[PDB]
Amino acid sequence: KVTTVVATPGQGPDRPQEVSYTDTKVIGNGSFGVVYQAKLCDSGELVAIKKVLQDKRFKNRELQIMRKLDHCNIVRLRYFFYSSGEKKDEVYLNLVLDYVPETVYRVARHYSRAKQTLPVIYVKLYMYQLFRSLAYIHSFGICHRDIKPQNLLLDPDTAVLKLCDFGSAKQLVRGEPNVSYICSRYYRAPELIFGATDYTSSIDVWSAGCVLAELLLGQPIFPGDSGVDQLVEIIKVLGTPTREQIREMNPNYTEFKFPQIKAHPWTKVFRPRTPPEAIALCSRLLEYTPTARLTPLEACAHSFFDELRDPNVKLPNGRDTPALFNFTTQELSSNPPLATILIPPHARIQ
Ligand SMILES: O=C(Nc1ccccn1)[C@H]1CCN(C(=O)COc2ccccc2F)C1
Ligand SMILES: [Cl-]
What are the catalytic residues? Predict the structure, then answer.
């Protein structure tokens, strides 16, 4: 059983290609629509196909963003094409992507269920690779707006991490306002809970901070069914925000009196042998004030990741670490001087 389409390649020029695939399973649907898995007939390589309804007014914002992206830590759009199903009179956009077997979510929870934490080496690798992907897209003025473990793909063998689901992703432009109903429940930044629409890309950094902590703690750090329940868990950890800070998050000061709690000494939040540089990093991402949070690029160059810049560092299975230092000038444009930290001596050797 074999389907053959004519699909436009993700990057490169408009050179339509005949693509045949088979073994079409399904792997979840959800809001957008269905996601299939298939095997490309010639190469035998696995792909994921995200099939979503195509709006007849505007062209699809996810697609437009995916074509402008090329980065080692972002899922590759191989092809995209259009189809339907039965009479319908409605058109579907099909995004063909490189299949990646695992996700941080699934892995994180395998370790959680078997009451263990992920080895810190894997935490470093995954987090670094995320911040690179954020650094890259932020450099185009694009915010993901839905950083969460379920959207961090993994190849367990290679330790390669790839950011996916660009369905909420959008070119943020200072002056222009954006919907405050975007990010998933536990990974929402305070300014989003307070319903701000003047938010920047720093929401992604908050979100990432929540992922780090969760990998350290082995469970979400800021849980809760309601905005209120979450804000409590945040206040418990960060302490009660000063009148200034609330003014910085959402200036519209939504109008609630929070209970007055002191900051829980950040070190007293995690397991006893938790690397202190990991803890430091957390607190520089999970800041109330959006501007006071590290940039992705600054985080990549944090001391917590020093072990990745060691020339001897290998994966515990023995294979080399994946690409970590092949920065582009684009990717560094945030702050080029950091190249002196990010690209270690041993990577400059000829
Ligand atoms: O989704 C996957 N890979 C993937 C996705 C998109 C692009 C490239 N690779 C794999 C990784 C682990 N997987 C899954 O979690 C199983 O599939 C899903 C189940 C429920 C909702 C959504 C789902 F995608 C299947
Ligand atoms: Cl042609």
Answer: 146
Residue 6 Cα to ligand 2 middle (Å): 12
Q: How many angstroms does the Cα of residue 67 sit away from the middle of ligand 2?
A: 19
Amino acid letter, 303: S
209 contact partners, CB below 8 Å, separation of at least 6: 282, 285, 286, 293
Which residue has the least CA distance to atom 3 on ligand 1?
100
Domain borders along the chain are 2-98, 102-347
Q: Which CATH architecture has domain 2-98?
A: 2-Layer Sandwich (3.30)
Candidates 195, 185, 274, 288; CA nearest to 235 is 288
Verify whether ligand 1 is closer than 6 Å to residue 28 (CB atom): yes
| Per annotation, catalytic residue among 146, 225, 229, 310 | 146
Q: Any known ligand binding at 33?
A: yes
> Which runs of E-coded beta strand occur in the chain?
2-9, 17-26, 33-40, 46-53, 77-83, 92-98, 102-103, 142-143, 152-155, 160-163, 170-171
What Å resolution does this PDB entry report? 2.8
CATH architecture of 102-347: Orthogonal Bundle (1.10)
* Residue 276: partners with Cβ closer than 8 Å, 6 or more residues away: 267
Per-residue DSSP letter, 338: G
Q: Establish whether 146 is a catalytic residue.
A: yes
Q: Is 195 left (phi over 0), alpha (psi -120 to 50) or beta?
A: left
**Mutational test site, ligand 1, from 25, 27, 105, 110, max ligand atoms within 8 Å of CB:** 27
Residue type, 276: P
